[PDB]
Amino acid sequence: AEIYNKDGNKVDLYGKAVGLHYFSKGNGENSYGGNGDMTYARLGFKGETQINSDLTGYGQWEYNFQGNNSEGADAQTGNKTRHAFAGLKYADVGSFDYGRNHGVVYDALGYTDMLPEFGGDTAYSDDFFVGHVGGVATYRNSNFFGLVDGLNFAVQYLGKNERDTARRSNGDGVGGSISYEYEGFGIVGAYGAADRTNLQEAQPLGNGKKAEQWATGLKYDANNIYLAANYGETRNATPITNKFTNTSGFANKTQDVLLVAQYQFDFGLRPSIAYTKSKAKDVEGIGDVDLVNYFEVGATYYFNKNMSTYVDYIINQIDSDNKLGVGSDDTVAVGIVYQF
Amino acid sequence: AEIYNKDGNKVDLYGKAVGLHYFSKGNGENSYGGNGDMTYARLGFKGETQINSDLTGYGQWEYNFQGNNSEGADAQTGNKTRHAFAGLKYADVGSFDYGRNHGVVYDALGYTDMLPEFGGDTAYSDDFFVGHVGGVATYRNFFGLVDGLNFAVQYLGKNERDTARRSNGDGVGGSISYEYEGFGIVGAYGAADRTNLQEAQPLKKAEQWATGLKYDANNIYLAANYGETRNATPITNKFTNTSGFANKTQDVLLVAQYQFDFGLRPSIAYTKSKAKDVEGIGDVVNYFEVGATYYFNKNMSTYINQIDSNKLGVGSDIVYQF
Amino acid sequence: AEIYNKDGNKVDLYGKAVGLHYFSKGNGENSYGGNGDMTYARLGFKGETQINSDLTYGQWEYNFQGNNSEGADAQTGNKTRHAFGLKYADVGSFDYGRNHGVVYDALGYTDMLPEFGGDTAYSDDFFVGHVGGVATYRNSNFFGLVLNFAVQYLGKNERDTARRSNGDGVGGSISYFGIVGAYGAADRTNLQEAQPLAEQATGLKYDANNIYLAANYGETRNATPITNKFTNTSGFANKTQDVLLVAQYQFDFGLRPSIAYTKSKAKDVEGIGDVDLVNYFEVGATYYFNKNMSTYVDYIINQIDSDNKLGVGSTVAVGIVYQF
Ligand SMILES: [Zn+2]
Ligand SMILES: [Zn+2]
Ligand SMILES: [Zn+2]
């Protein structure tokens, strides 16, 4: 909701309130998602200022508040800052922001991250270039300095974050992305590589001096139709954690595909089908394991622009003999989301 | 504060800044509350959208920020998401919302939860149906026909918390009220399955109910509520270091408050809750209240334990808003 | 940003989004400030209502850190800065809650650097910074006679750690180029007295013709906390001698170059005796774009000895802050 425009500074304060619930077989411990309450609410601001006819300043922020938690010591469980950065867009030169932003490989992963509740499984938080990552400088360029229409590229730095845990750690990195949209159709191809922290390399699973992610995507966005498809492979990046022995680490090689097909009613109902598959290779002692693999049947009915409900049943494809203990039961979400 | 209204969507962003200090004998170890700083702040949003003339959508949220905490490692303590739900009201059919909302037994218990700071002692958080409870589906003047009487039905899904205090299972709850002639009646009850963790506590189904009768007119507030819980109320022991729920409790809440247009609102209240047939000690909070809250405008305002020295060790001895 | 005026009530909801990063040789083991990401965000409200003709506030401010991951460390740095009053005619103000310390009034004249500076202003350290639950009576323009004064009550705060604990105390400040002086003393906590290693400054400033010349001196008495890397033991400097010098000229162009020198030295601390806490030379060039978006560089020449008692480090910030 735009709540202030004066002396030429726009400030949008937005928020959600998703009443959410997962259903699986008796506390879905062996399922895709889980079981019970998932109610959460977000609260961020978008702020743009106009210094010149060409130069604008922005700063975005976004915090996650969890409603499933009690008022005990776990009241903060899941509370986190999703977005926090500030930047300058200048004429046709391009934009530049630093802070906690998306990774270049999310530009490519964005094409398919569109299911009502689930999807975008490959887009891990604090996993280098596929999602929210702390302290990252990002230069983006739209329409190649205004010359070519549709061709966009971006270039990302991503500085070192020596975390206490190896799960969220990262070192000096480099990332790129390229897109081309031509009347409905869309192609994209991102790639990024970074040094792995010594704590990450001292993990049981996964070996290699540096981490690497890339993915390429196609989409059709016209006539109230979305057909999204992307594929990507990580090498020494994806967290995997064996459920049996409770020993975590990174997958030496992954092969990930996302297919999304949804149609949009002007009536409001948006049915969605989706198939995802992320398969690990060269697992330190197991070999080829399926991280995630399923079919999706989703129907979101937007009431107005400020209110909706949705259902996301996920056909869990993972066989019971999963040599990593990853869930094999089915999950279905039921949500009523208000926003502003 | 209503901060946005456009294209059929009202959005209210509200907040408080209570500067509060507690006073008891010395450090108030065995007191009602505590002693020292108690400063805190609320900040939440309310948000209704008009889908139709009949169908309106809503969403609320509220989070607590404590001020008495230092800026160090303890800064997050007390910070909690109070309210968070999203629902639909439809013509005279009624409302339905899911998320962290108010329990049906609070509808009847809320008749007396109107003291300045204290009061509503039986309204325990994450305690089945008597307070702020996580993830709960809630349906709330009889199809528009009979005005002045409202009913509600609540579901409450299972919540497998680490601690026994906050856990629960599948349940059912009802509430029915009737208000007229500046007065109101209400009666709510609920029952639920307990987790095996809950069943395995020293001190497997929980029951809680209460009724309330009140009168508000001529700036006079006369509230009374009474009810009993069964295998619900947590209490634990300080001496024995043993936690658990009370087999049965006997709870009464008596409030009388008069609002003087001058601003001073004197409030006299008496509360009493006695646990029954507790496994170890048998039958064992109760006090009389003195309160004067001074309403300035629509924003600014400012504002006797009867428990013998007890086999349990129960204690003895300015708000801006927008 | 004022987001609501109706029925004579102003509700200003403000916020920032600072993209910060510290630079040091390889890692920040033996540096002043640190190294890596420092991105954070502020978000509070300033709420004033007029009750009558003469008598009229409620303020709050929370910290959200951005260098944290969405793992377990997400609330690392998250905290409330402010939460609390009335001003009546010429009587003056009075508020209770988590607010500033009276010794900050003198320290505030020099707490004016891009990112660093104001080292004497520790959080929850007697009266030199942000402290919880304090009644503060402040009077404006001396009842309209001339001069400004304030009195803080500072309630007891029985904290688990010795560093963040506090008891009852009293502090005063008076201000009127510009000069100011503040003093405060309080009963030390049980754990304050039971620690191996309290009373506490006056200020001068000149803010006119696009120049800011700031100078203040202060001495601590068993309140400034410190620990040493060698013996890993917490405590309090029995006495410190603190100086802050700030000299900056603000161009109409927008660029604001700043040079600053700070020095705080502890005295007869039970264990190390007289040691120098912090000492450096600062060169900063903050560039205000407009009244919202701005950036800054903050190079700091660390004047702490290598062979240093307590082993304090022997840095340069780069920020791009949007605000509202
Ligand atoms: Zn995002
Ligand atoms: Zn409530
Ligand atoms: Zn402050």
Numbering used by the authors:
A (entry chain A): 1 to 340
B (entry chain C): 1 to 140, 143 to 205, 209 to 289, 292 to 310, 315 to 320, 322 to 329, 336 to 340
C (entry chain B): 1 to 56, 58 to 85, 87 to 148, 151 to 180, 185 to 205, 211 to 213, 215 to 328, 331 to 340
Paper text:
Herein, we design metalloglycosidases by constructing a hydrolytically active Zn-binding site within a barrel-shaped outer membrane protein OmpF. We supposed that a protein containing a void space, such as β-barrel outer membrane protein F (OmpF), would be suitable for our study; its overall shape resembles the structure of host compounds, such as cyclodextrin, which may provide a structural basis for various functions, including catalysis, by encompassing guest molecules and forming noncovalent interactions. We inspected the constriction zone of OmpF, the narrowest region, approximately halfway inside the barrel-shaped protein. A coordinatively unsaturated mononuclear Zn-binding site, a common catalytic motif in metallohydrolases, was created by placing three metal-coordinating histidines.
As a result, two triple mutants, R82H/Y102H/R132H (OmpF1) and L83H/Y102H/R132H (OmpF2), were designed as the parent templates. After protein extraction, purification, and refolding, they were isolated as β-barrel trimers, retaining the native overall architecture of OmpF. More importantly, both proteins possess a mononuclear Zn-binding site in the constriction zone. The fourth coordination site was possibly ligated by a water molecule, which is again suitable for our studies. Of note, the empty coordination site of OmpF2 pointed toward the periplasmic side, whereas that of OmpF1 is placed toward the extracellular region. In particular, D113 shows proper orientation and interatomic distance between the terminal oxygen atom and Zn-bound exchangeable ligands as 7.9–9.5 Å and 4.7–5.1 Å in OmpF1 and OmpF2, respectively. In addition, D113E mutation (denoted as /E) altered the glycosidase activities of OmpF variants; OmpF1/E and OmpF2/E showed substantially elevated activities, whereas that of OmpF1Y/E was somewhat reduced. For retaining β-glycosidases, such as OmpF2/E-R2, an acidic residue, possibly D113E, may initiate glycosylation as a nucleophile when Zn-OH2 species acts as a Lewis acid.
